[PDB]
Amino acid sequence: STQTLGLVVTNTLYHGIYFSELLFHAARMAEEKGRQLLLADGKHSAEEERQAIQYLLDLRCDAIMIYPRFLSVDEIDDIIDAHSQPIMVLNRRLRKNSSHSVWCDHKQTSFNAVAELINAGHQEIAFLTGSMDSPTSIERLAGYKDALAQHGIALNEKLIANGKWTPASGAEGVEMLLERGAKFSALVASNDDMAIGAMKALHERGVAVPEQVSVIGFDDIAIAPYTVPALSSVKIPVTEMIQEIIGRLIFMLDGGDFSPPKTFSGKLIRRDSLIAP
Amino acid sequence: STQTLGLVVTNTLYHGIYFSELLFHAARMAEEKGRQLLLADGKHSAEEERQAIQYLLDLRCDAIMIYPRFLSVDEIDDIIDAHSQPIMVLNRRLRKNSSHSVWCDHKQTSFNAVAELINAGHQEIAFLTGSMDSPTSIERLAGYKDALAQHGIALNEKLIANGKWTPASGAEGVEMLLERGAKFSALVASNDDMAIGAMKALHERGVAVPEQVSVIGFDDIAIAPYTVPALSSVKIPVTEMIQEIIGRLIFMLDGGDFSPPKTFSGKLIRRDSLIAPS
């Protein structure tokens, strides 16, 4: 051991609070356990993310933590197999070395939130995706589909619009949906930023929220109760996920007592933006 | 030299984008220049922030960067005097070793924004502060007072309410202003989060924005043009400040040609939330 902890900086600053919380807690744990915290720049590709892991392995960090934007889960499994130093993965699910990853069931989480809309009487529900290549975005669209299929609703492909996680893309998403004449009493945006953009575009086109269109988001950002109307959103337990990944790492390095690996999912917080049609 | 760069993690993640941007660019520079980037936890006091600096100095980082929440500017000046390794300070103004600090004139920035409200015809202007012990919040309230004084308006202390940088505290701010019967056609929140909270409380009390009350904030967050109405806000050039602090540090360690040290200020972006009364 070198008494050294590694963290890959990825292009995920501002994409929820995952990275900054990971950073905060990893800094805290490193100081408490008396080890050095090293940063590596993962830059802007899968190869560069791998290089950043490799650089920390070469300097012989006892452990490495990463929330990967480009580097696939399968490639990381291979790196974990090749090295005795634990590589911890946040917000992804590893197939082989699953105890090295802490994840949230974004598919089931989306399902449940869409199911609550159906149970409140919404039959025609629009969906605004995040980025096409985003694992979380793929899972949230899957959960939406799965919820429609299990409640006997036919998949209307007109009701699904592409987004980019940004407020602009949320406004554009509504703009697209209204132009192709899609009809809906509810809209699910894949994050709160897109939802606020969606609500803005709906307001500017004379569509009442929640009276005509109910709106939900994901993230439960601090701003959400203070929108007009107050934004219903799915809270993800990010802090608990971070505490889980740190605790799991402490055990892998130092031992001590064991805690049964938790699984995580979110919950919809109903607010003024969601009613029954 | 050990080819090592130090960064103090402080209680300032989510307090604007200062620390996150600093971390990004410090990570990039360290990789480009082939040096290791070390983190130290500055925790939750002035003493703990000093300890973090000391820990990095003891490990012999060539340089240390910090955005200090608790640790005084005068104390940091002393530490810089005692050590040959550059300690760089973001978003604070050092009195003696001023080339080690990159700062924004938050007082003048606030002044200018409040001056634009006066020049648009607002005479009674409410103010929501950030935290009492925040340097930026002190500076912004000072600029507000300075603007009222120079445009011949009497300081009405009833128009000033305490806040905590959060959306809740912005709503509470409006609540307290309305209860003590303060009259205003404009409101300045010290950040966008407070402004959105303020606008929510104003809407729930039947006060029209911008028709009755114009609202401005600070930060220019990505959400701002998508609020109802679109939030006018002061944009701080954070990214230029970070490039400035990194550029200075490159010169101090590796040498070369430098840009003459800049100083920085923000400007108000006018949006739908701001008009001319009545």
Side-chain angles (χ1 to χ4, degrees):
Chain A
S1 289
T2 50
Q3 300 284 266
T4 303
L5 221 134
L7 175 63
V8 175
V9 186
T10 54
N11 208 14
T12 49
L13 281 61
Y14 323 116
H15 190 70
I17 64 166
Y18 293 97
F19 179 81
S20 29
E21 288 296 298
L22 178 57
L23 192 128
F24 181 82
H25 289 81
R28 197 145 301 257
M29 183 265 271
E31 208 280 336
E32 284 169 12
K33 292 286 186 292
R35 47 225 312 177
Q36 295 179 17
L37 184 61
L38 261 290
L39 295 200
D41 187 18
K43 305 183 189 297
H44 294 103
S45 66
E47 191 174 58
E48 286 161 321
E49 281 187 356
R50 184 186 213 99
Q51 276 162 25
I53 295 176
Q54 198 55 62
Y55 163 80
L56 297 166
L57 287 164
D58 291 347
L59 284 179
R60 271 223 267 199
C61 298
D62 301 339
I64 295 156
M65 325 180 76
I66 180 169
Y67 170 27
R69 156 66 46 237
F70 296 97
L71 195 49
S72 78
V73 131
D74 287 333
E75 290 186 73
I76 297 164
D77 262 315
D78 289 340
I79 304 168
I80 295 170
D81 290 332
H83 298 90
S84 66
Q85 299 110 314
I87 299 145
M88 309 307 297
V89 186
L90 175 73
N91 198 33
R92 300 281 178 256
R93 200 222 191 150
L94 291 165
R95 262 164 269 217
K96 186 179 175 179
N97 300 284
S98 83
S99 54
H100 288 245
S101 62
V102 175
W103 73 89
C104 187
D105 199 345
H106 292 292
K107 152 105 105 148
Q108 186 62 55
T109 296
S110 183
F111 180 94
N112 294 340
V114 180
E116 285 192 45
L117 285 143
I118 299 163
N119 291 343
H122 298 274
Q123 289 285 300
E124 291 168 287
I125 306 166
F127 190 91
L128 302 187
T129 71
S131 290
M132 292 184 74
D133 56 4
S134 160
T136 305
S137 174
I138 286 158
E139 286 180 60
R140 281 178 194 164
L141 174 62
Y144 162 83
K145 281 150 100 202
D146 228 62
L148 296 197
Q150 289 188 28
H151 289 71
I153 309 161
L155 219 176
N156 191 356
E157 302 225 322
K158 265 153 152 286
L159 298 174
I160 299 169
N162 178 66
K164 253 128 126 7
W165 304 115
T166 66
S169 71
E172 291 152 25
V174 155
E175 217 62 48
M176 273 183 280
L177 290 165
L178 293 184
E179 191 182 22
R180 59 215 202 203
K183 244 82 204 9
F184 52 95
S185 59
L187 182 139
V188 182
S190 299
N191 76 1
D192 282 0
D193 281 21
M194 285 192 281
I196 292 166
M199 287 188 304
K200 175 69 173 182
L202 288 162
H203 175 76
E204 284 187 314
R205 296 281 275 232
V207 182
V209 178
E211 293 89 3
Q212 296 183 248
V213 176
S214 274
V215 179
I216 65 157
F218 287 75
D219 286 345
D220 188 36
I221 63 172
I223 271 315
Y226 302 93
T227 55
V228 195
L231 174 65
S232 314
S233 186
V234 174
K235 186 170 190 62
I236 310 292
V238 183
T239 299
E240 290 88 340
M241 289 166 71
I242 308 303
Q243 287 171 319
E244 177 75 21
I245 205 161
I246 295 290
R248 206 98 66 103
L249 189 50
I250 288 168
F251 178 75
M252 289 187 193
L253 294 171
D254 292 335
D257 38 31
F258 194 83
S259 199
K262 292 179 175 49
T263 188
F264 298 92
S265 65
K267 213 214 16 199
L268 173 60
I269 300 171
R270 245 151 284 121
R271 296 204 175 90
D272 287 334
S273 76
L274 168 63
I275 45 98
Chain B
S1 292
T2 47
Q3 302 284 266
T4 308
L5 223 129
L7 172 63
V8 176
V9 186
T10 53
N11 207 14
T12 51
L13 14 159
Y14 323 117
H15 192 68
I17 63 163
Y18 291 99
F19 180 78
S20 40
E21 283 299 291
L22 176 59
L23 190 128
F24 181 79
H25 290 86
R28 196 146 300 256
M29 184 264 268
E31 206 280 334
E32 284 173 12
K33 290 292 188 292
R35 50 225 311 173
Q36 297 179 18
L37 184 61
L38 266 283
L39 294 200
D41 182 15
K43 300 185 194 299
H44 293 106
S45 67
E47 187 170 62
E48 286 163 318
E49 282 190 353
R50 186 187 213 101
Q51 279 163 21
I53 294 174
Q54 197 57 63
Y55 161 78
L56 295 167
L57 286 163
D58 290 349
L59 283 181
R60 256 138 355 106
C61 291
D62 304 339
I64 292 151
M65 328 182 76
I66 181 168
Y67 171 26
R69 155 68 43 241
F70 296 97
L71 189 53
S72 142
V73 124
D74 290 326
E75 295 186 68
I76 296 162
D77 259 317
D78 292 338
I79 306 169
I80 291 168
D81 291 325
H83 298 91
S84 72
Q85 301 105 317
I87 300 145
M88 311 297 309
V89 187
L90 175 70
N91 200 29
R92 297 283 179 261
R93 191 192 59 92
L94 292 165
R95 330 245 278 340
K96 167 194 185 174
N97 296 278
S98 70
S99 46
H100 287 245
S101 65
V102 174
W103 59 297
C104 175
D105 199 346
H106 290 295
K107 155 103 104 142
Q108 185 61 52
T109 296
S110 181
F111 178 93
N112 293 347
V114 180
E116 286 190 48
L117 285 142
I118 298 163
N119 293 342
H122 295 277
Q123 291 287 298
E124 294 165 284
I125 303 165
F127 191 94
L128 304 182
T129 71
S131 295
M132 300 181 59
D133 47 7
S134 161
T136 304
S137 169
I138 284 159
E139 266 141 84
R140 284 184 190 157
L141 176 62
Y144 162 81
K145 286 156 137 194
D146 224 67
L148 293 195
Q150 285 190 31
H151 287 74
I153 311 158
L155 218 176
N156 191 356
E157 308 217 323
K158 212 147 300 176
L159 299 175
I160 299 165
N162 182 67
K164 281 159 70 184
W165 304 114
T166 66
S169 69
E172 295 150 26
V174 154
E175 220 62 52
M176 291 181 299
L177 289 167
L178 294 180
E179 190 184 18
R180 64 181 96 130
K183 300 290 172 184
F184 52 97
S185 59
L187 180 139
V188 181
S190 294
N191 77 2
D192 287 355
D193 284 23
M194 285 194 280
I196 287 160
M199 285 186 307
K200 172 68 170 182
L202 286 164
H203 177 81
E204 283 188 315
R205 283 288 198 194
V207 183
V209 175
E211 293 89 359
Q212 298 183 248
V213 176
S214 271
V215 178
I216 66 154
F218 289 75
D219 287 355
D220 190 40
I221 59 171
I223 267 315
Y226 302 91
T227 57
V228 198
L231 178 62
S232 308
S233 184
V234 172
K235 183 172 195 61
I236 310 294
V238 183
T239 273
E240 291 88 343
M241 292 166 67
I242 309 295
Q243 283 168 320
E244 181 71 26
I245 208 166
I246 293 284
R248 283 199 204 154
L249 188 49
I250 287 163
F251 176 72
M252 288 187 191
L253 294 169
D254 299 350
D257 197 55
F258 65 74
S259 298
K262 306 189 199 291
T263 229
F264 298 93
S265 72
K267 93 159 205 292
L268 175 61
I269 300 174
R270 297 228 13 194
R271 290 202 256 264
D272 288 336
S273 77
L274 167 64
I275 45 95
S278 181

